[PDB]
Amino acid sequence: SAKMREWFSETFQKVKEKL
């Protein structure tokens, strides 16, 4: 499983999208 790992990818790009 990977709830926080798969989300990790959706967290780094969440910061780049905000910029």
UniProtKB/Swiss-Prot annotation:
Domain of life: Eukaryota
Protein name, entry field: Truncated apolipoprotein C-I
Organism: Homo sapiens
The encoding gene: APOC1
Residue window of the full protein shown: 61 to 79 of 83
